[PDB]
Design an enzyme around this catalytic site. Structure first.
Site, PDB file in Angstrom:
ATOM      1  N   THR D   1       1.076  -1.465  -0.146  1.00 15.08           N
ATOM      2  CA  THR D   1       0.375  -0.171   0.218  1.00 15.08           C
ATOM      3  C   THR D   1       1.101   1.004  -0.328  1.00 15.08           C
ATOM      4  O   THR D   1       1.884   1.112   0.610  1.00 15.08           O
ATOM      5  CB  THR D   1      -0.953  -0.005   1.191  1.00 15.08           C
ATOM      6  OG1 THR D   1      -1.766  -1.185   0.811  1.00 15.08           O
ATOM      7  CG2 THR D   1      -1.708   1.368   1.492  1.00 15.08           C
ATOM      8  N   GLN D   2       0.948   2.409  -1.403  1.00 14.03           N
ATOM      9  CA  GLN D   2       1.194   3.295  -0.977  1.00 14.03           C
ATOM     10  C   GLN D   2       0.225   4.249  -1.316  1.00 14.03           C
ATOM     11  O   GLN D   2      -1.138   4.593  -1.354  1.00 14.03           O
ATOM     12  CB  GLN D   2       2.070   3.319  -1.601  1.00 14.03           C
ATOM     13  CG  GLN D   2       1.744   2.859  -3.481  1.00 14.03           C
ATOM     14  CD  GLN D   2       2.783   2.926  -4.205  1.00 14.03           C
ATOM     15  OE1 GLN D   2       3.771   2.101  -4.598  1.00 14.03           O
ATOM     16  NE2 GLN D   2       3.101   3.798  -5.299  1.00 14.03           N
TER      17      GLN D   2
END
Ligand SMILES: *C(=O)[C@H]1NC[C@@](C)(O)[C@](O)([C@H](CC2CCCCC2)NC(=O)[C@H](Cc2ccc(OC)cc2)NC(=O)[C@H](CCO)NC(=O)CN2CCOCC2)O[C@@H]1C
Ligand SMILES: *C(=O)[C@H]1NC[C@@](C)(O)[C@](O)([C@H](CC2CCCCC2)NC(=O)[C@H](Cc2ccc(OC)cc2)NC(=O)[C@H](CCO)NC(=O)CN2CCOCC2)O[C@@H]1C
Ligand SMILES: [Cl-]
Ligand SMILES: [Cl-]
Ligand SMILES: [Cl-]
Ligand SMILES: [Mg+2]
Ligand SMILES: [Mg+2]
Ligand SMILES: [Mg+2]
Ligand SMILES: [Mg+2]
Ligand SMILES: [Mg+2]
Lengths: 196, 222, 204, 233, 198, 211, 221, 198, 196
Positions: D1-2
């Protein structure tokens, strides 16, 4: 939003971009952010469009009722009414307003009312999301008692830079000149101010 | 925070005849309130007289179909070009889906074909591999609109012999391929009217002992 | 949690040739538990019929409210309320409770006594009017009813034909919803007479 | 996740009788700040494919490096690297499509929406979309982010279905793309006046146009607008 | 929670109500009467939140007893249930609602017929041949769906309750310490003191 | 709704045939009984995929036992294989309640309750699923060890019908199974649509319905 | 999908006719064009009940004000009354309106947002189809349009919404407000989404449905 | 939750364990033996999470039975309890701990003395004259604080349990469907089949 | 933090303020934010002090090992190593780094690496919290191929404005001049730059 008001030799000049955004969508690209509250007292609106409009409408009412009774209100008086609404309703308002007016005795005056509802009288004031980018430029280039031509240039150069960097700012540069001569509406199109 | 899943809308419909089967689906692909494509095929010929459609999240749908098509290729290689029976395909897809039980393929998948007796067959699957053989099934966005219509018009549910005082049920009969295509096109014209994610085009794949034929029909583009 | 999904139930209304039909299921449950197989969701105030789905306490409350209001209307106006007028009364009544609404899906059906014109209408819980010429649907199996009605329905059906169509629309939609069914009643409404029929359906 | 940091906006594209057109502005936005102005978001691969990328620029630069490697690796032990066994738009797309879906499936996506425009060896127009979810689709017109909402509606007036493609010329198609870019500059707050435009024709080959500007803008009507309702001056 | 059962037979309504009152991991009492006589031919059993349960019952009792003296007349079971439903239907949208579920068993002296009304805390009223509140229903409704007849005597009705209580004592997790049984017929309300082993 | 009870004449196993996706009715024609071998039955309640996959898998592990030990697997051993597997996945989100019912010469008629929590119980009577309380209500009030094969079959059928009626998440049809020393005998599919009215008339019950 | 377009001698508003509950189409032909006063018309997007209620309330108050002052209603009045009401409710009344009309002071075009912000323009659009419509307006709009040009542009802008937006569909409603004449309301100005004839008739043979009990209902008192 | 009692008298340890296995709103079984024989003179009763409870008991039983065959010798009650505590003390810091509470009653044939060990799921061991787990303790300890003597016969010990069960049947909310009682003495482990009415 | 690097006729000049803050407390008022990774390749650090130091230390290691094997690395090569660390560890790093170096062939070069880990080659680059205030000033006053004296003035004027407006910036203005001549350290004290 990029807004500013500048005192000069003959009076004061209000300037603003014309961009209103809901997220990344430009809801209105020809917004008039320079609002009249009296013949020669105008204000620059920034923040919630709903809140700043509701406030300006109420101020225009208060100054019209003031005029009926006690004659022409001072620029300070107008700023005090703006303050009173903003401060006393600080919890339910997101409004940053610059008040600028021409008095025959006091000449040109600029009052700025940030979020808190505090009042600050300044030679010139800058506000809105785009103002952050031109603090450097405006401090270095502003002189007191400039000419009309000089002041228009200062605002035109300042707001063009604010528009260039801020995505929330853009469109046309509207100005409103307040002197003893009267009220002058100025507009500057991208094809001019972009190539400064 | 990143969301691995999405919804590309669309609807699919499988009906089993006596000696044939149809798997139909709209050709519209959507994201939120935008149309991605008016023609993006969703129902696929997988070989061995099997047609498959995994409707829901297009990415997970394409991934599953791709893995099953590959599963058929390796069934040939490993079992001397033996034909994969529709029942054997169904059980194979259960394992493909249940493999990702704790990160599922966000799709409702239907396969159509002929059983080993030559009779038309439709198998439907839940996202994690649960499957049952059925006479007909609709999956995806407008499944809730179409399934009740099928129950009534394919299996003659809540229908009785006139003047028998609702004692004698309507004879349970097999429909012709022409009669089935009529029900499919009426199901999709109806679905298109009342569901925003359904429209643009209808693509039907028909499976007989002779092979896989394709019919295409325009749907409303609003 | 969702007050529209606690008790369950459905209502559907259809227009025919110089006639209207309004039908409903009889189920009153508390989530999975079925409680009553006799809970009717269609009421009438003169010749105007109202079907109400959603939270059962609000169904009963609104029935008592609209009987109250139509009784006062009749005493003042010295005539029975018309479907078009009653529709507006339901709308304004629901929007009165905008920020504390009745969790209901009302359906008006009837024939204007003067013009003889068949009329049906539907509302959301805050009283937005949905005026359709063909059919109106409401309840926990609204998706199902929309699908059945959109397929089965054709304009200008005779009362005897319209009965078969609305009955099959309701029955087959109800049998695809856990919270609907447990018996059904259909109203066939004409200018002069109104026939009420209880359908034999699945008790699961 | 970013989360995406430096971002590029809309990529717009359509197919005409002989080839495909794709365009994208030259901006790298840092939230509301219009930070970088010399950013190329159209990546040419060989002389038959242009990859237009929107979203995170750091992830775009990664995909740009992956494509230069795909060219290098294809040339290895391949005497037909500039002929029969050259990289096809469909080969380049399916590779990117495979990577995007693998990255979403590892819960570490490339925060991008990609359009692979090009012409196949048999002269067929290739145009297909892929994003951070690994979702893929083809249409006579494709556009990412804001383009999907404003560009597509305009480009679909020129090519509504497949049968309209052979009736559309390069002049009509390019004019429609150049108009759509101006409309995006009007209403998209994360857009730029300066844009790049690439044409892949099955006759004239690859034409890459740099330093294009939105011209013929209507602003004159702005002078007549005063206040927000009741104001007369 | 607490067990609230009601059964309407030929010529009577029978109400069975659990005797247990529990706070935490303690059974404070094993002889609690979870019912109030509203009028000589109308009885209301109740279960729910600790305080609300009795406060609501006594409030309804007070209002019906006031009406009885003012009009020198007994309200029909139907009329009493309609009053109670409206009070709960008001309560549900008030600042703090009454979280109380009630059964109303009454003999209508006018119609000469027993009547059983089931009302939940939302104000959801319904007339039933047999009723239950809380988790009791989950086991008792299928029992009564099987064994119930409308022509059953009061004696047959008590045997049918005994069968319901036995099932709840077998399959329900909590010890509800038996039930108090009350018959509502043409002669008014009496308590079956011998249900500990009938 | 699934039940299995033990009596003089062996074991009765009865199940409904409904699949649900919340308040959506997925199917009315579904199998909740897996015929593992001619003398071993498995009932299915909870997650559709979970039940189907692991009970089909149990069938594989039971075949593998008779190939290895040249003997039919015991009910106790069969139940404990599913029990131990389910326990490996405890906390993962597996949802399944199941009854393993069979007859071996060693054990006689035997029923084992196994759920996804890891609980494994031997007993004579079990009802599993959303409608278990409804099935229990009818079953418990009519159960004797000395019921005829005919009467035991009926009580089982009737207990599912009761649950099919009251429980919103049960219905479609009733599938009956009888387990003797000769193995399981299928006693047919009974559509609740037709069975309800037949039972209502012939028995005089369901007096809460109009008709 | 709602738009407003000013021409040289008045203003035109247009709208689609799709009402939606989530993904389901509730009404295939609902009128989103409302009359505040005879020559002031309103197009509504957002919460359906809110747009209808707020339009009827200000319409009622505008009528009473018109009778009181013995003057034609002004658009700036409808505008001020709508914005002050919507603002008071801090956006909890989800009404997004394009208010247009002609009055003694000339022709006017405004947009009102749920929080009580107002905009003035020569061309506007609101709703889920706002961006599809605005793309067409920004492409084809010029200064000094004719009546027929303005109707064409406004109609084209709604069509953009109908085709390209899932929130919008079915038909195009138009209302023309010219300075000199009466406002003309063109209900279903376009019907480009007619349902093709069904493949089969689903008329049931009479006696198909099983009936338990039958009775005549009493309507007369 | 489930009732787990243990009492050590003159020449024996008595373990009383509830027969009820409940899941949701239903009592699935009313004859559950919540104990495993680890060795001929050591018995372990258990209660806690649904799956963990039996899985842990059988795992411990398997290990003690393996040791018994390897050494052809019975581990002392002290030694068995120390092994069990360490297994739980490992479990508590593992990915998914065993949520099981145990009583270990054993007759030490070497010392000729009965021994009762109480261990919780954390691995908190302590030797007691009498023990309980869960909510049982809140009533039984004070009762046993007053009525217990160390010189009591097995017969006196059963009478003292009967008194504990009666109190739990009076004041505990849930029906635990009686207890299975087992005596651990010099002659090994036997079950008191007549505690339904002793 | 206020940091910038400017290419000019003879090479490139790095500039930075000297203020490190933990909240409103100035933890260090004489910080050296201009970090050497090679003889004539320097970087300006902005963001997490821990992260930017850890990165710079690793880069200096990589370029020392590069030099041992392949000789003097290009300014582009240094920027590529900075990028590779920043991009591939984007989830666990809050670092904004400007890379500036003097090559004899390429003259002076400036690369900027914002949070994402993207690379941008520019004539000049500004970064840190204080940079927002001088976008206006820097765009208007920057010319290509300035003299050493001119470039020092441009940075001195730019950073003085950034320091004046940004509370997170202040102290001394450190500069590092990179030409063929070598490496020159410059410092400018408040008593000088404040009164510009
Ligand atoms: C008697 O008490 C019956 N009550 C009905 C019912 C439906 O609850 C059920 O348990 C039935 C069991 C059989 C098993 C054999 C195959 C047919 C179904 N259960 C379901 O139908 C099941 C309900 C359910 C869903 C989810 C969970 O845990 C989250 C528990 C129970 N339905 C499904 O599994 C549907 C299948 C229809 O599409 N699928 C989904 O809900 C999809 N999700 C499953 C969970 O993982 C994510 C995907 O029968 C008993 C005996
Ligand atoms: C063009 O862009 C059209 N696009 C469609 C739509 C939906 O955006 C809409 O604004 C349309 C406006 C018309 C519809 C016909 C009656 C006159 C108004 N709006 C709707 O259809 C509206 C959508 C909507 C629902 C809910 C919310 O917030 C919760 C926002 C928008 N529909 C409704 O409001 C339905 C009734 C429609 O039959 N009601 C509900 O969803 C009930 N909820 C209301 C809020 O409280 C909770 C329950 O037309 C534009 C112009
Ligand atoms: Cl702002
Ligand atoms: Cl530092
Ligand atoms: Cl910083
Ligand atoms: Mg549309
Ligand atoms: Mg149903
Ligand atoms: Mg109730
Ligand atoms: Mg059911
Ligand atoms: Mg400072």
């Amino acid at each position: 939003t990029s807004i500013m008001a500048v005192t000069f030799k003959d009076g004061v000049i209000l300037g603003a971009d014309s961009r209103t955004t809901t997220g990344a969508y430009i809801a209105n690209r020809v917004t008039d952010k320079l609002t009249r509250v009296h013949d020669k007292i105008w204000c620059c609106r920034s923040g919630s469009a709903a809140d700043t409009q509701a406030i300006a409408d109420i101020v225009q009412y208060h100054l019209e009722l003031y005029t009926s009774q006690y004659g022409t209100p001072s620029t300070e008086t107008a700023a005090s009414v703006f303050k009173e609404l903003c401060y006393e309703n600080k919890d339910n308002l997101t409004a940053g307003i610059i008040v600028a007016g021409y008095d025959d005795k006091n000449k040109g005056e600029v009052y700025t009312i940030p979020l808190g509802g505090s009042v600050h009288k300044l030679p010139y004031a800058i506000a809105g999301s785009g103002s952050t980018f031109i603090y450097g430029y405006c401090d270095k280039n502003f002189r007191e008692n400039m000419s009309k031509e000089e002041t228009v240039d200062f605002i035109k150069h300042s707001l063009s830079q604010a528009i260039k960097w801020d995505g929330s700012s853009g469109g046309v540069i509207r100005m409103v000149v307040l002197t003893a001569a009267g009220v002058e509406r100025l507009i500057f199109y991208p094809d001019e101010y972009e190539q400064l | 925070q990143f969301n691995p899943y999405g919804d590309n809308g669309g609807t699919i419909l499988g009906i089993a005849g006596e000696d044939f089967a149809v798997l139909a689906g709209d050709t519209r692909n959507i994201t939120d309130y935008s149309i991605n494509s008016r023609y993006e095929p969703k129902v696929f010929d997988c070989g061995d007289n099997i047609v498959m459609s995994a409707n829901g999240f297009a990415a997970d749908g394409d991934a599953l179909v791709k893995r099953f098509k590959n599963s058929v290729k390796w069934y040939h290689f490993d079992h001397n070009d033996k034909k994969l029976s529709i029942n054997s395909a169904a059980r194979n897809i259960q394992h493909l889906l249940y493999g990702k039980r704790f990160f599922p393929y966000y799709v409702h998948t239907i396969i159509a074909g002929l059983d080993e007796d030559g009779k038309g067959a439709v198998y439907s699957f839940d996202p994690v591999g649960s499957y049952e053989r059925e006479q007909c099934r609709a999956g995806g966005a407008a499944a809730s609109l179409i399934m009740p219509f099928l129950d009534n018009q394919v299996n003659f549910k809540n229908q009785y012999e006139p003047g028998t005082n609702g004692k004698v049920k309507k004879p349970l009969k097999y429909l012709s391929v022409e009669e089935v295509i009529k029900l499919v096109r009426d199901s999709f014209t109806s679905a298109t009217e009342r569901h925003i994610q359904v429209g643009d085009g209808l693509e039907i794949l028909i499976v007989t002992k002779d092979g896989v034929r394709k019919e295409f029909y325009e749907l409303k583009r609003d | 949690s969702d007050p529209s999904s606690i008790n369950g139930g459905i209502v559907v209304a259809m227009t025919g040739k110089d006639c209207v039909a309004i039908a409903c299921d009889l189920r009153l449950g508390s989530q999975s538990l079925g409680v009553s197989n006799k809970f009717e969701k269609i009421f009438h105030y003169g010749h105007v019929f109202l079907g109400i789905t959603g939270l059962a306490t609000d169904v009963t409350t609104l029935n008592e409210m609209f009987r109250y209001k139509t009784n006062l209307y009749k005493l003042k106006e010295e005539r029975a309320i018309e479907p078009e007028t009653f529709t507006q009364l339901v709308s304004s009544s629901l929007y009165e409770r905008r920020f504390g609404p009745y969790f209901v899906g009302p359906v008006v059906a009837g024939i204007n006594s003067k013009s003889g014109k068949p009329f049906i209408a539907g509302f959301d819980l805050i009283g937005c009017i949905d005026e359709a010429k063909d059919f109106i649907v409401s309840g926990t199996a609204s998706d199902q009813l929309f699908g059945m009605c959109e397929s089965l329905y054709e304009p200008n059906l005779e009362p005897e034909d319209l009965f078969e169509t609305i009955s099959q629309a309701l029955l087959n939609a109800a049998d695809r919803d856990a919270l609907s069914g447990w018996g059904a009643v259909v109203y066939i409404i004409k200018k002069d007479e109104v026939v009420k029929r209880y359908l034999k359906m699945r008790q699961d | 996740t970013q989360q995406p940091i430096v971002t590029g906006t809309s990529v717009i594209s359509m197919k005409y009788d002989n080839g495909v057109i794709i365009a994208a502005d030259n901006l790298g936005s840092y939230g509301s700040l219009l930070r970088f102005n010399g950013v190329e978001r159209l990546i040419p691969v060989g002389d038959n494919t242009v990859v237009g990328i929107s979203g995170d620029i750091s992830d775009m630069q990664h995909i740009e490096r992956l494509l230069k490697d795909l060219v290098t690796e294809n040339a290895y032990d391949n005497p037909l690297a500039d002929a029969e066994e050259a990289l096809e738009p469909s080969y380049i797309f399916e590779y990117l499509a495979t990577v995007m879906y693998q990255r979403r499936s590892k819960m570490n996506p490339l925060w991008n929406a990609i359009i692979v425009a090009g012409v196949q060896s048999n002269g067929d127009q290739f145009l297909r979309y892929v994003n951070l979810l690994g979702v893929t689709y083809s249409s006579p017109t494709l556009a990412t982010g804001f383009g999907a909402h404003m560009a597509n509606p305009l480009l679909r007036k020129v090519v509504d279905r497949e049968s309209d493609i052979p009736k559309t010329t390069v002049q009509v198609a390019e004019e429609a793309i150049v108009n759509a870019m101006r409309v995006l500059y009007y209403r998209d707050a994360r857009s730029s006046r300066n844009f790049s435009l690439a044409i892949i024709d099955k006759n004239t080959g690859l034409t890459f146009k740099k330093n294009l500007q939105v011209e013929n803008m209507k602003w004159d009507f702005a002078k007549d607008i005063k206040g927000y309702g009741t104001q007369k001056i | 929670m607490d067990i609230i059962l009601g059964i309407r037979v030929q010529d009577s309504v029978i109400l069975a109500s659990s005797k247990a009152v529990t706070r935490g991991i303690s059974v404070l009492k094993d002889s609690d009467d979870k019912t109030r006589q509203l009028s000589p031919h109308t009885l209301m059993s109740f279960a729910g939140e600790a305080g609300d349960t009795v406060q609501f019952a006594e409030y309804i009792q007070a209002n019906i007893q006031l009406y009885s003296i003012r009009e020198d007349y007994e309200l029909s079971p139907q009329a009493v249930s309609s009053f109670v439903r409206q009070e709960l239907a008001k309560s549900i949208r008030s600042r703090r609602p009454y979280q109380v579920n009630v059964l109303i068993g009454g003999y209508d002296k006018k119609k000469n017929k027993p009547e059983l009304y089931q009302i939940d805390y939302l104000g959801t009223k319904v007339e039933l041949p047999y009723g239950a509140h809380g988790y009791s229903g989950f086991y008792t409704f299928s029992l009564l769906d099987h064994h119930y007849r409308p022509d059953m005597t009061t004696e047959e009705g008590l045997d049918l309750l005994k069968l319901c209580v036995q099932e709840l004592e077998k399959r329900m997790p909590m010890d509800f310490k038996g039930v108090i049984v009350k018959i509502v017929d043409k002669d008014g309300i009496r308590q079956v003191d011998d249900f500990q082993a009938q | 709704t699934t039940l299995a009870f033990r009596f003089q004449g062996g074991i009765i196993v009865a199940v409904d045939s409904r699949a649900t996706a919340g308040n959506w009715v997925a199917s009315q024609t579904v199998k909740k009984v897996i015929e593992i071998n001619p003398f071993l039955l498995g009932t299915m309640a909870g997650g559709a995929a979970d039940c189907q996959f692991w009970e089909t898998w149990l069938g594989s592990q039971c075949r593998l036992h008779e190939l290895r030990e040249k003997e039919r697997i015991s009910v106790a051993a069969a139940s404990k294989i599913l029990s131990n597997l389910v326990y490996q996945y405890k906390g993962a989100g597996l949802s399944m309640g199941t009854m393993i019912c069979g007859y071996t010469r060693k054990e006689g008629p035997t029923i084992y309750y196994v759920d996804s929590d890891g609980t494994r119980l031997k007993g004579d009577i079990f009802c599993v699923g959303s409608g278990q309380t409804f099935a229990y209500g009818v079953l418990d009030s009519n159960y004797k060890w000395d019921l005829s094969v005919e009467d035991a079959l009926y009580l089982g059928k009737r207990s599912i019908l009761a649950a099919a009626h009251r429980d919103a998440y049960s219905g479609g049809s009733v599938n009956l199974y009888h387990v003797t020393e000769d193995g399981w005998i299928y006693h047919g599919n009974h559509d609740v649509g037709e069975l309800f009215w037949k039972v209502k008339e012939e028995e005089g019950s369901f007096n809460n319905v109009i008709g | 999908t709602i738009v407003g377009v000013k021409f040289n001698n008045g203003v035109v508003i247009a709208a689609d006719t799709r009402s939606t509950q989530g993904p389901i189409v509730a009404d295939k032909n609902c009128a989103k064009l409302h009359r505040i006063s005879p020559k002031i018309w309103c197009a509504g997007a957002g919460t359906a009940a809110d747009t209808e209620a707020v339009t009827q309330l200000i319409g009622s108050n505008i009528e009473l004000h018109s009778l009181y002052t013995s003057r034609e209603p002004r658009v700036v009045s409808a505008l001020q009354m709508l914005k002050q009401h919507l603002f008071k409710y801090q956006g909890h009344i989800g009404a997004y309106l394009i208010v247009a009309g002609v009055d003694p002071t000339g022709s006017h075009l405004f947009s009102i947002h749920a929080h009580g912000s107002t905009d003035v323009g020569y061309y506007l659009s609101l709703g889920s189809g706002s961006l599809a419509a605005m793309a067409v307006l920004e492409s084809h709009w010029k200064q000094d349009l004719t009546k027929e040009e303005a109707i064409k542009l406004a109609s084209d802008a709604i069509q953009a919404g109908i085709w390209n937006d899932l929130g919008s569909g079915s038909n195009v409603d138009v209302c023309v407000m010219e300075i000199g004449k009466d406002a003309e309301y063109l209900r279903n100005y376009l019907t480009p989404n007619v349902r093709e004839e069904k493949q089969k008739s689903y008329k049931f043979p009479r006696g198909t449905t099983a009936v338990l009990k039958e009775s005549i209902v009493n309507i007369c008192d």
